[PDB]
């Protein structure tokens, strides 16, 4: 293991800003070479909880750390070519306490935005962890709720998010399994077409000004040559007694359409987030310009009617291929 001034040299560290958290631990963004970057930070290995759960092991993190890659990597590859995940910098594993320049911008969030999460001042100089600089992917999807245009939006959103499931079903046998509103980010871009690559065949799709990242690989699933790599959540009690939102049932349809073996490709679960998905765009996303003509009260039947006919779909692949919404 490296320290924590590997990864955050002191101008780096400085320039830290908290934006996210969850029982995992915390993002940070900070920059480097004028490039902003995201930093996901993980306690591994010892004995405390920390946000009222055990630590992974080095064996359990080891999954999202190569799903990570493996996605990333479909940004440079020919037959099946994606951007939309998000870009992996670097991997370390890092042993110390936790720096006081971290603990200045932890600080800063719970004083302006509120944490659910513990004060990360208890670990000592032995602690592990694994620090995942990714690329800066912009504002997730539910911290826009009332920020996006019009459902224009939503569609060029849709189509991106089900493009990239698609390249990575068909490259990788991938299932995101997680696909909640936190992990689907936006940022601007000046590019009018964004483009993809599937089973060789290349196409595009209208950016409406946004590029969209899918981010958190926790809960998801690949194989390479046979070999799978995944979260296995067969004997997990609290991830199937969720309510209040259509995301915590939608753990309970992966589980059904499984048979509770997290190790088979059920490539329906991208399908069934994609569902829940088009549900916040329908009900809890509110737009700055309602669809107060025809043509945009078009675009908002499309999505009506493709939020009744996505779950008779197999697969992101059969969506994006079959589905009239994106024809
Ligand atoms: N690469 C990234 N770029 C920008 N924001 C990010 C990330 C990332 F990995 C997490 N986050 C944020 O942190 C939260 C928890 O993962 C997410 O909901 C996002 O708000």
């Given amino acids: 293991?490296?320290?924590?001034?590997?990864?955050?040299?002191?101008?780096?560290?400085?320039?830290?800003?908290?934006?996210?958290?969850?029982?995992?631990?915390?993002?940070?963004?900070?920059?480097?070479?004028?490039?902003?970057?995201?930093?996901?930070?993980?306690?591994?290995?010892?004995?405390?909880?920390?946000?009222?759960?055990?630590?992974?092991?080095?064996?359990?993190?080891?999954?999202?750390?190569?799903?990570?890659?493996?996605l990333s990597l479909?940004?440079?590859?020919?037959?099946?070519?994606?951007?939309?995940?998000?870009?992996?910098?670097?991997?370390?594993?890092?042993?110390?306490?936790?720096?006081?320049?971290?603990?200045?911008?932890?600080?800063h969030y719970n004083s302006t935005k509120g944490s659910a999460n513990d004060r990360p001042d208890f670990?000592?100089?032995?602690?592990?962890f694994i620090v995942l600089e990714f690329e800066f992917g912009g504002i997730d999807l539910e911290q826009m709720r009332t920020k996006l245009s019009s459902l224009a939006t939503a569609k060029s959103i849709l189509h991106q998010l089900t493009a990239s499931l698609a390249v990575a079903e068909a490259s990788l046998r991938f299932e995101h399994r997680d696909l909640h509103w936190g992990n689907v980010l936006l940022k601007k871009t000046?590019?009018?077409?964004?483009?993809?690559?599937?089973?060789?065949?290349?196409?595009?799709?209208?950016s409406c000004g946004?590029?969209?990242?899918?981010?958190?690989?926790?809960?998801?699933?690949?194989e390479?040559?046979?070999?799978?790599?995944?979260?296995?959540?067969?004997?997990?009690?609290?991830?199937?007694?969720?309510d209040g939102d259509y995301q915590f049932d939608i753990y309970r349809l992966?589980?059904?359409?499984?048979?509770?073996?997290?190790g088979e490709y059920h490539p329906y679960s991208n399908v069934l987030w994609l569902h829940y998905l088009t549900d916040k765009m329908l009900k809890q996303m509110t737009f700055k310009t309602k669809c107060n003509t025809p043509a945009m009260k078009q675009i908002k039947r499309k999505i009506q009617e493709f939020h009744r006919t996505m779950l008779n779909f197999s697969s992101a692949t059969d969506?994006?291929?079959?589905?009239s919404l994106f024809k």
Wanted: aromatic fraction near 8%.
């Fill in 319 to 323: 969506l994006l291929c079959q589905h």
């Fill in 74 to 107: 479909l940004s440079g590859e020919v037959c099946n070519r994606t951007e939309g995940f998000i870009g992996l910098n670097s991997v370390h594993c890092v042993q110390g306490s936790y720096p006081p320049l971290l603990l200045k911008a932890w600080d």
């Fill in 123 to 128: 670990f000592k100089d032995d602690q592990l």
């Fill in 190 to 206: 000046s590019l009018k077409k964004l483009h993809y690559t599937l089973n060789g065949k290349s196409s595009t799709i209208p």
């Fill in 254 to 262: 992966m589980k059904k359409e499984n048979n509770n073996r997290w």
């Fill in 1 to 70: 293991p490296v320290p924590f001034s590997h990864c955050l040299p002191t101008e780096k560290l400085q320039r830290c800003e908290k934006i996210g958290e969850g029982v995992f631990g915390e993002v940070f963004q900070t920059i480097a070479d004028h490039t902003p970057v995201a930093i996901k930070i993980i306690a591994i290995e010892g004995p405390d909880l920390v946000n009222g759960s055990h630590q992974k092991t080095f064996e359990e993190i080891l999954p999202e750390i190569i799903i990570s890659k493996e």
């Fill in 210 to 222: 946004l590029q969209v990242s899918i981010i958190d690989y926790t809960l998801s699933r690949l």
């Fill in 224 to 242: 390479r040559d046979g070999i799978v790599v995944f979260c296995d959540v067969s004997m997990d009690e609290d991830l199937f007694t969720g």
